[model samples]
Target chain A: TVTYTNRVADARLGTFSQLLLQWKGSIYKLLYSEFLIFISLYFAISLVYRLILSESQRLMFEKLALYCNSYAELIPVSFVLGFYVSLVVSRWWAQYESIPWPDRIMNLVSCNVDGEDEYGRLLRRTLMRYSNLCSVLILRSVSTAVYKRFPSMEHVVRAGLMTPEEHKKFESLNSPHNKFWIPCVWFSNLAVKARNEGRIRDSVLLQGILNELNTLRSQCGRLYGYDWISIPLVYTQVVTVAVYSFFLACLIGRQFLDPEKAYPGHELDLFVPVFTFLQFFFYAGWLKVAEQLINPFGEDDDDFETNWLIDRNLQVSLMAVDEMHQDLPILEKDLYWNEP
Target chain B: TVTYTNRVADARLGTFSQLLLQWKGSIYKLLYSEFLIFISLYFAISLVYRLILSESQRLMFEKLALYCNSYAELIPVSFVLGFYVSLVVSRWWAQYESIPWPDRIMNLVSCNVDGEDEYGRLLRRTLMRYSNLCSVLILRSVSTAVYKRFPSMEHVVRAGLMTPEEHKKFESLNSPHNKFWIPCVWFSNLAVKARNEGRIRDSVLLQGILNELNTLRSQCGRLYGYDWISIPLVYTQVVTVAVYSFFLACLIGRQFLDPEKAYPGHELDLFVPVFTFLQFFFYAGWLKVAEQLINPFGEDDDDFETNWLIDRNLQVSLMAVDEMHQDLPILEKDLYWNEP
Candidate 1:
């Protein structure tokens, strides 16, 4: 019976996975194609600027070229950084999983449960939180990559690669860079701030929590290892500081010192800021791929155990239904005892 | 039994939907807040440049503003165009749904399922394609909005908003220019080349081809609405453009046309880019909302039926399980026969 159900589930899961795979595949393909096309377009624009634009016009176009180069550089860096961040978070969650519930609770959020006086329930909550984080991280990485690439295209469009006003309107749609950074901060904040909150404790739910957490931790760790080559993940703080300092130096040098004069080694003042953007881009992309590898147990069409969740939920629900039906007589007896 | 299953499924689906709804609602609220914050940041940057920048600095700032302003205007127009293109594709899919099997096959892709043919299976494949396309179009729309917003953040981070680099990155991201126009060119080239080879047969596939052609023609008609709206959009565009241009032109023109002109309009020119950026900022924002209204199935966390798709896939899997279990004897026989 289980084999048959498994086969059926696998087939259905396969179809869902295939469709999801197609969507995800297309997203990556589209992004890759866009990158290639933009690269070609930038070269074409560079050729035109170098061949046609006068001294002043050349200066303007060169500035445009710098932006294009920087734009290209930024995409990959952001991707990588985002991926690194995810890996770090994944590793942290994995460690949390290995430790006992007391330690896990100390590190992350505590849980509350009902009708069960076991640690397993508490573990489940931990597991769910871990899974949720993994999913959110993956989406965050994807959104960041998409966000970076669009603006780079916007720059070219405004330069008359395409029509006017339309691209601007498009830019407006993408407005709000905080979408990327804010969530990370919020999640991180929640984890740190809720450390000692009394609401996280519930003795009756402990067993379920431990069970769920163990399942989540093991599944997520295994998934991450299976799909992603574990690397030394870069901390967000480290990357942020590096990027910030680099940009600051560029701005300060350009404003207070002579911009035209080459720095001791570097010839351009714009190079630092451009390079910083590229680092962020690459890191962000890598983070996306890494997140997908980390959180393997989700009901997402692409993730693991969605059907199982449905089936399991259904089975439990069926038992609940049966219990309710059986309990109707008990409830009637209680009511009649009170009246008679 | 069916009622029990249905009730259980509905309960589970409801739980899943509620979770999704909460997640989406939070994401939307977060994005909306971020959107407003981004616009304000753009304004703040422009205001600072106007107030504090020296006359020489203002001239440089103004020169860069012209390109960035033009770039900003292009984003929404491209968004509108992306919608138009997807609309055409969707209408073609809808027509395909209405056609019969033999005709549909000959028109789309010819397939042969000789014995025990299943209409339901065929319909499933056909409908899945449409569903996938709809999903893709929505994702494209959301990405467009996301791209628009982030480059502004990119500009602020790089301090490129008042520089020429901002303009180039802006255009590079605009999709109507990148995804739509480039692919259109590629497709037309392929079609033209294919026709010359006489590979085009006059079958239902050809008729389906004709239907696609008709949709494209209507798409051209639909684009006119954008053109009509483009007038008001242009006025706003020009106002923002003029504000940036005038401010920058005055700053530069005074320096170039006659530095001895005593920095004429330098004070007012300073404030204009800030004002203009705001006008364009709000315009881009409102346009983002409008696009979302029109294309409700976008991939933004807040948009569409992702949870439903997952649930539906799970349902199909569960049902298939029942079928598989009932047919286990046949499977066992087949396994025994294979063993012999």
Candidate 2:
């Protein structure tokens, strides 16, 4: 869940400007297809008026251009795009934080749940397995990419997140809700049994393990919540239509009418329409930013690696509580130990 | 830190629309003074052009109006305002989440720390005190409202979060960074001592207490980061200039000129500039949202209630660990005890 950081502490002028030349995760990468299409359509409209239309038809086209230009910028497209894009990015980051990491719970379980026997190794491993398993269950449900890897319980059991006996019991649970939370309930019961049998020494220690597990459970619950509840659909539709329609007006609105006709904003017929294109990039680029971030934990290079997350967590939790039980380093004093 | 929610589960139409009538935290509440001043000046300019100026001067004013309107919307104020206001609200809500709560750590201490004897109470109370004290220290620094209540360390001691001896050790620590973390180190050392003395029972249990303390410490660290690392100042200045300067141009550019001489958009004098004022409400209102949210953990009606937060955490933690130690309700059968 912890995002990696390489803070840009100092990039005075020349250093930071070099970032502008790179294409990875840049606005141009997301915008180029729409950018090309916009330019093509703009020139196509430009040619029809300039070449095919008669003098009167040409005069009529110039007035249309002026009217379109006047009306185009009147939409509140900028604010809607800005707010919606902001919401999308915010949700994407919140999703990143909600990603369940087993490290904290694995440490507590590894340290607290003692011994290495059929009971001890078996107890700790099953407990650690439950921690990662419920997380895998939810991620598979919420994240499509993760679901592709773990398509059925056969896949989950095959991957060793669920064993044959556990999958039998998992399938036996007849419930209305999603089965992701079943592993958490199993963890709770197993911990309680561990407490009753004194595998967990005290009630305080048992609750501590339960407390950490509950936090991981909450992380899965939040991810599940995020999948269902997004920025309200009405708000999304409002912003999308506002942006696309504003540009729809730009089809005729921003053309360079001939200077001979002398329409309001089209005096020069500058041919390329640089200002209109720049405006298009600013508004439409922001809209595309929202679109790209909608399925944020996606299969892209920068997507939260859902299937990769599963393997690391499953491997790490097993190693920490299973193999690394009571593992320690030498406690010999060093030369500087006396100095401190 | 949990923002209260009374979810509106079913509000078809009329119920939800009533929210706009609310004056508190509404855009109108923030923008009204500027709203009035803008309207006054708009009419003041309208009166100047209509009543004072002569025929050629009026012709000159009409031409000037056309020039001003043409240039005003070209500034791209809409996008700048949209992005900046979005940024401001995002940070404000992030600040809300960073607010440290002692509730979780308080429960851990209340459950783990043993006994009512002088030494036992002394250890538990001091441990709980450190949890709230470090939080109080940071909030007083970050939030002006919190600082006013605990203006000096004397006020902090008076509130019973610190004792005479601990404050002496706290002051003696010659550190370069903020002193809020001193109490955290105290909590750490005490928990380690408790482990050594067999009071905390095990190293695992001692870490359980320390783990919760560290979470509370991390919350304070996040709030401290919010205080320092905000949205870059250059971005703030650029947006401020763009919005205000756009409206500054509005004073000259949006005047109702003599329609007889005829500029492009001023066919009807329309006496009042309705569209321009509506534009003013939108741009300036969003900018004010940013300004109001700048010091978000503020003392106003709907702010984070920083001083109140300090009181509640101190009182709740003390009550939980001290008075409510080992307290329990009768573990009796409930409504559904045998139904299942």
Candidate 3:
């Protein structure tokens, strides 16, 4: 993950100011192309008004500019942008939370499932593999990066996410729906089988593992839900229209009119529109925040590293359930034990 | 809960428009007092400018009004409000999620924990009681309404949230931390004891209950976290300053300039500032949204019904574990089941 979350941890005076200098994932990076386009348009309009327009034409242009300036406030940029970005950000954080980590399930499996024999090791490893495979399958569906890595079931098989027999079984399910949940069912059944074989010592432990599995299943469902039901197109359209139209108005309305024919607000002939540019940066950059975070699985600098998650989840789940199964550091009385 | 969530579910044409008329938990109800105060101040300033000021003083007033009107745009009201309200809205939803619901745990406990004897009944009831007690303690800490109801642990005992004996043990625990977690420890210990006694049939079942208990624990921890680490005071102060200062500027800035003077925006001699009033409604109402939602456990009309939740949780948890214990409906083959 391209996480600069650590950089702004303290919220000190320069924390956000420091972020402005960064080339990666900053507003400047996102808005530069748009900014250039805006500046080009602004100058074009300014040149037409100053150099090209006749006196009478300039007077008409000034009135039009005035009209555009007054009516631009009708767009309600702030209100729509606020609501739209808020919705996008909430969904973004929710998507992050819904990314199922296998740590909780792995902890339960490693601790509660008994024996260190070959069979026990096989059971534990297989269980974790199933769990990882479920997440991988789900991730492949939602994340473009994961989908690129595992383009087909064959790639998944080659990557050891699915054995050939299990792949065949998966294919044989005869369901039209996304079969990400198929592995979840396999996990449940195998866990039951493990319980019958006394690998999982008690019903409590088995139920615990299954409960955690359900939690992971629900989280996966949430991810799928987010992907399926995006922020309303109308809402996005409204925000886009508002921001673009606001800037469009700024092109004429914000032009420094001729100082000879004085408009009340346009007193000084400031060639560059300083506040308008800042306003553009604020509003357009805010929209970019929504665009980047709207689908965090995409290849944005701020997007979640789904490939890293897949690798980390697989490696960590296996390590926790297999290598760290019943493995503990030596216990000793702490300083607090005697003091308490 | 005072939930109008259902009212806006369909998002029909009049969905939000209908909600505007609502007095309870609405923008109008929340903002009327502030709105009246704003109107008083605006008219007071308008009267001073129109009636009291001499010709020279009126010219100075006009200049000051023009200045205020121009510089008012300097405050980034929408940006600050958007960010601040977004933060509040997220925390509001997070707090809602963190308010522990015992349904998941109760379902597992009812089905898994065996025995129909008096001891079984006692065990089941006691387990549910502990679960409910944990939430009650947490709710009392966070919710003003819940706190008012159960002002002390004695009241908690009187209300059947804790037994007198349990209250004694609760008092005896010398930990300085919030004792909401005390019941959670008791729950885990008691659940293990029940497992050893074979009331809970298997490790799977026991672990399922414990896992759910831990889920409940973590949710409580989230609630505590939300309460303990609030949105930074500086951020709130910044937003408050921006909003208040903008309106303060508006008091002078939005005043009708004398028609004889022929200022740019003040061309209309409209005595009433209709658009300014609307702007006040929008910004002030937005701020009210934050105020109501910021601490959702308050007695505000739109605030979370914490008292209702406490009752619902207690009643539901008891019913699930006690009356619903092994209480399955008579098995019958369904048409879908037969077809499948």
Candidate 4:
């Protein structure tokens, strides 16, 4: 829901220019608080050195500034930030891919799980329920918004993801593990039952349905994997430290030294520190990208809209299985049917 | 093939240090030719300024060098390179995932597809062949090494991926798009036929195999997607230009000025530019990571060992479906079974 990807379709001179003006999910919004603090501290130090400092004090400050300036490059800001952000961005995309789309499973379930009777309807609904329940369980664990919506097993039961009987069964399982896989096992067992009852037409079709279920199961496992093994904390800490330290050095180092003193590369007394500000904007903005995308299931402006996803998945999957079961447009001669 | 990922088990101080000294797939090996050229040019420019330039000429050269130094920061080398390398690395991993590992499909095919007769073996082999053929066709299109091995459909025939009859049928199909999906469709049809003949036990199982086939198909499709829609040319050009131009500026800007004159950063007439050389190493090595990973199917030292992958996949798949059909170790109670 936070996606403004469509705005960037036509890559023109002003493609990113348009993006810069956006308030929501913009770099300006993400970095403005930090930017203000940076500017405030920078000017405070500049004022102290320029107006309040004595001659010897000014000299000491200038030397300190020079030392800070020279040593700032040793921080390796770009290298660490670059590597860290890359890892975060890659993980973000991987998480997106791992999100179990029930469409594939729903497709086979509706068509292959053959029946139009009440029992057939129950079977289809129950199967889709199991599929949705597995995702709901995983999503709740990973996404804050989903967890908020479904605070407990009762919430899930009330939401109709699990029946009272099923809930009891779910709770009855005597294993100290994430019970998300329980539904998948139920799905397989139910599929076998359907095949035995001659509703699932053949074993090939049954296996196909089970295979899709396993695919969903593995995707759930991957989501769990991502949740379990995040990008190494030490690596993130290293990057955060590098960026903050670089900017800390920048506060003194990038100050406009007195032009009367004529220190090398300090000819001008531009109060505004234009290049340093831009560097802060870009580098800090880069770090903010990592922060926003780090746990994409959060409620950040750029984070995945997991609540919307839950609603959409549930609605679409139920519709695909129940309302649209065996529903097709009447077959007739098409535009290209006779052309060949 | 040159992947030495196993060497770095524990994150000791020497873990990366050990990696740095290796010849194969090392940054030094990848970048030495470019590094030599860079050093040669830097020193040549240095020698011309020191040994050849007059006083006024040196003054002019110093100003030019200062100008170059000031402007070099405008190139945004770290920002551009960071983004580009990240894109390449992500794509490389995506390609790896898209490799269509036949293990999943082979497992289902070997166990689920019922039969112990010669006819049963033929059915399993043909189905496995279709699966492998789908991958081989996709790989031939994506990987240069695979393409070299299977230059034509006839080569595919010689390699036993496609029988001559199947190849004839393949060529006869009227489609302008990549025909990698043809084998997938053939697979589905054959699978359905096998189910109808009572070899595949049930409809559910048939659908399971077909689902796996589609998953493989989509994976191959993703491989094609990566091959087709590369990191935009403009982005690559921007990164390449930034790195090269930064070094180009370094040639002049990094030269040691006259110590008597006492430039701010140019304190000593140290013959070698130590910091500049290290910067060159780090930045150039960073770029080499991108170059080696951009097309992972290439024969680069760090590129995917696709030739081996092809051989391994084909051999493993054939053996799994043929030799290892229902070949399970006798099931016995495990140590934890009684306790559980």
Model 4 TM-score is 0.59
Query: Interface RMSD (Å), each candidate?
Result: 28.5, 12.4, 12.0, 11.9
| Per-model TM against the reference | 0.23, 0.58, 0.59, 0.59
Query: Where does candidate 2 stray beyond 4 Å?
Result: A1-7, A14-16, A331-340, B1-210, B213-340
> What tens digits encode model 2's per-residue C-alpha lDDT throughout A1-340?
1111111112111222243454655556777899999899989988998799999898888777778777876788866776777777678767766878776676567766756687989999999899899999888888878888878999988888899999999888898889899989999999899878877767766777898889999999999999988789999899989978887788887776676655555444447765567566666766776776677666644456688668767776676676556542221221111120
Q: For model 1, how does the per-residue alpha-carbon lDDT over A88-148 read when each residue is reduced to its tens digit?
A: 4555355334321223322233223221322323222322232343333323232222223
The candidate that wins on lDDT is 3
Q: Evaluate model 3: give its lDDT.
A: 0.77
Docking quality class, candidate 3: incorrect
Measured against the native two-chain assembly using Cα atoms, what DockQ does each of the candidate structures obtain, in the order listed?
0.01, 0.03, 0.05, 0.05
Please list the residue runs of candidate 3 whose C-alpha ends up more than 4 Å from where it truly belongs after superposition.
A1-15, A338-340, B1-75, B85-340
Per residue, candidate 3 scores C-alpha lDDT tens digits across A196-238 of: 9887766767877898899989999999999999898999888
lDDT of each: 0.32, 0.71, 0.77, 0.76
lDDT of 4 by residue, A1-340 (tens): 3443223322222233344455766566777899999999999998999899999999999999999998998889888987887788678767877888676677677666667788888898889889989999999999998899999999999988899999999898899877888899999999999989988876767776887899999999999999999889999889889989999999999888887887887764658875577667667767877887889888877677677767766776666566545543222221111121
Off by over 4 Å in 4: B1-75, B81-213, B216-340
